[PDB]
Design an enzyme around this catalytic site. Sequence first.
Site, short mmCIF file in Angstrom:
data_model
loop_
_atom_site.label_atom_id
_atom_site.label_comp_id
_atom_site.label_asym_id
_atom_site.label_seq_id
_atom_site.Cartn_x
_atom_site.Cartn_y
_atom_site.Cartn_z
N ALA A 72 27.94 36.51 -28.74
CA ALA A 72 27.17 36.12 -27.56
C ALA A 72 27.19 37.16 -26.45
O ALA A 72 26.42 37.03 -25.50
CB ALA A 72 27.69 34.78 -27.03
N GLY A 108 26.45 40.41 -26.91
CA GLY A 108 25.42 41.39 -27.14
C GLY A 108 24.09 40.99 -26.52
O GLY A 108 23.91 39.88 -26.01
N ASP A 140 32.62 36.07 -28.69
CA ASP A 140 32.43 37.48 -28.99
C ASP A 140 33.74 38.19 -28.73
O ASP A 140 34.47 37.84 -27.80
CB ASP A 140 31.31 38.10 -28.14
CG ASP A 140 30.88 39.47 -28.63
OD1 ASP A 140 31.75 40.37 -28.75
OD2 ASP A 140 29.68 39.67 -28.90
N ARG A 171 20.78 44.47 -35.19
CA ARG A 171 19.54 45.24 -35.26
C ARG A 171 19.89 46.65 -34.81
O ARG A 171 20.88 46.84 -34.10
CB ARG A 171 18.44 44.59 -34.39
CG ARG A 171 17.50 43.69 -35.18
CD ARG A 171 16.63 42.82 -34.28
NE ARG A 171 16.37 41.51 -34.86
CZ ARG A 171 15.54 41.28 -35.87
NH1 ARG A 171 14.86 42.28 -36.42
NH2 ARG A 171 15.38 40.04 -36.33
N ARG A 224 18.54 50.69 -44.49
CA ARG A 224 18.97 49.38 -44.03
C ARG A 224 20.45 49.23 -44.38
O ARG A 224 21.08 48.22 -44.07
CB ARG A 224 18.18 48.22 -44.65
N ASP A 261 9.64 37.31 -37.12
CA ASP A 261 8.43 37.68 -37.84
C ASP A 261 7.28 36.73 -37.53
O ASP A 261 6.12 37.14 -37.52
CB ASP A 261 8.70 37.71 -39.35
CG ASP A 261 9.80 38.67 -39.73
OD1 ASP A 261 9.90 39.75 -39.11
OD2 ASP A 261 10.57 38.36 -40.67
N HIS A 290 13.09 39.34 -44.72
CA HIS A 290 13.11 39.69 -43.30
C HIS A 290 13.17 41.20 -43.09
O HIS A 290 13.69 41.67 -42.08
CB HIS A 290 14.27 38.99 -42.60
CG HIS A 290 14.16 38.98 -41.11
ND1 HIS A 290 13.05 38.48 -40.45
CD2 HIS A 290 15.00 39.41 -40.14
CE1 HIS A 290 13.22 38.60 -39.15
NE2 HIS A 290 14.40 39.16 -38.93
N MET A 327 14.06 38.77 -29.87
CA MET A 327 14.92 38.15 -30.88
C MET A 327 15.65 36.94 -30.31
O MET A 327 15.79 35.91 -30.99
CB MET A 327 15.92 39.16 -31.43
CG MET A 327 16.83 38.60 -32.51
SD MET A 327 15.89 38.00 -33.94
CE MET A 327 16.49 36.32 -34.08
#
Lengths: 300, 311
Positions: free
Chosen positions: B8, B10, B34, B81, B87, B150, B177, B227
């Site tokens: 939480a 971030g 966090d 992200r 990836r 998305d 995703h 996001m």
Amino acid sequence: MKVAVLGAAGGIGQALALLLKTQLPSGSELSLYDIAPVTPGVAVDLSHIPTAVKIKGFSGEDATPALEGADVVLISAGVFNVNAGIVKNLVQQVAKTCPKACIGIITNPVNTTVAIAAEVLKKAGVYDKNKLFGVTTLDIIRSNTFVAELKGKQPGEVEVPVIGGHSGVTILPLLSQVPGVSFTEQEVADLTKRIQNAGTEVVEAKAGGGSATLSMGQAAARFGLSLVRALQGEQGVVECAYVEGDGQYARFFSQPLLLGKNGVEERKSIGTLSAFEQNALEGMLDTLKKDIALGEEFVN
Amino acid sequence: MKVAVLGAAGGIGQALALLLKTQLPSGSELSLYDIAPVTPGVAVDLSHIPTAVKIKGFSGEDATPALEGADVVLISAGVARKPGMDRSDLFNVNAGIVKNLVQQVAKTCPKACIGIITNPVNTTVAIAAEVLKKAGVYDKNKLFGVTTLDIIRSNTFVAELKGKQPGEVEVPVIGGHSGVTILPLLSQVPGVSFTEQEVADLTKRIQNAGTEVVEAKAGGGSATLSMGQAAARFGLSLVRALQGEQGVVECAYVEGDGQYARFFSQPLLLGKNGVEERKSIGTLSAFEQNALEGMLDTLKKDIALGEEFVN
Ligand SMILES: [Ag+]
Ligand SMILES: [Ag+]
Ligand SMILES: [Ag+]
């Protein structure tokens, strides 16, 4: 209607810009400016949210493209003498590009930074004391939160008027004017203490890693949305904000304000205080008077 | 109803917690966790907002007090992200973090619904599932990969191209995703029509919409506020379904019947125990048919990569 947010890359600015993008009326415009190079991507980030609010972001040292056509300019820039200089710089760019916009000052200390903005606007010849506000909403929504839990009420229906300044003993919640509730002096004293020290509460709890950002963005958003509603013609919109009034207390004073199509339309009476409420009133008017002169000395 | 947000502190977590604090039902509970020591003050910050949602934040490496009695767990921890390596930079960074937290979830709130925000979602959900299994508490109806970013991106771009109000457009997106696994069913958007050029160009943009934000953020930042909004939409829809509302449908990444892959995003009717019914993806265009079959074994390699890591 177009809203400009100066300092949009900071913690307060990003939270404020997120709420504005999702809550501004459809057809509104939102411009983000901040010296941080990330700022144009903060707007692209938000632009992927499917609301009918267009948003663009700007960086660099020139804030002009974000202020063109701005109806409201909210300034949460900076990180005292560096923040006072940044406030002076940005108000200069506003007076050159959007002189008749409404200006909400978020950058702290509000008691001093509003005075800086006023002197900058006067030296430019574009000063409207009905269009410059010191955003103090955080003290109000804090007071609403604290009062609602003590007395077991719906937090979203409590509205505590807060007058004076935005710093310490200058923050005066009028707990006697809250309908349907009474407080012991033990509760009047404790609540007034917490509301004037609530900023420290978040400073200590963040392990020395920052100040209030998310609640402040929520409070800045409430003020901005109230201002846009009144600017767009809505009647009866009242928010307590730090403005230049009649001088009956200080040159700059926060009271309940009726907002209209040209910024402030009436500076409402503060009502009639409790005994302790004017003890705390008069018992700080020079502490507020000194904060104002500090702002006027800085420019010249 | 208690909602736990892991990670939480971030950017995604703070934006998510801000929207949840104001939009969760009255009487709801919000717990922030966090490892960053700022997290308790993140909750004290949000605690000053006059809504009927109580909030407290926890730090350290133990997420147990935040997970205590949680009905929903939203995990946006680690580096949730964005585009790094192909990836796989993110995998090696986040795989151990997802495993750690899902483990703590399985021994404190094994019955909670789990929403995985931390990326790569195609693979991190497989890590979560296998970790829940070895703890003996895996519920396939309570583990979601949050793909709502998305959908709201597709809503934005379709409303933009077709001149419609953005809040009125709803685009189903199935598959995965990331990249070619992101399949928006533009042929199912009610009341509009596209060309092959528009379908291919809109798909291409939606499949790489994260790069729009990265190169705009001067290469130094990811989609955090959009996001947080997308994660808020998914969490609020889940909470509504958990409290008894019927007809709540959200596309999300779950373990299905394996018609295409073990994990697959599709329209999900939500209920009081998570997934109520996995709805069919409907009739597909020729383009959406080609897109679907052309992405499955890379989706399967995504799923396989996460299973190998836990055993
Ligand atoms: Ag104005
Ligand atoms: Ag559940
Ligand atoms: Ag759907």
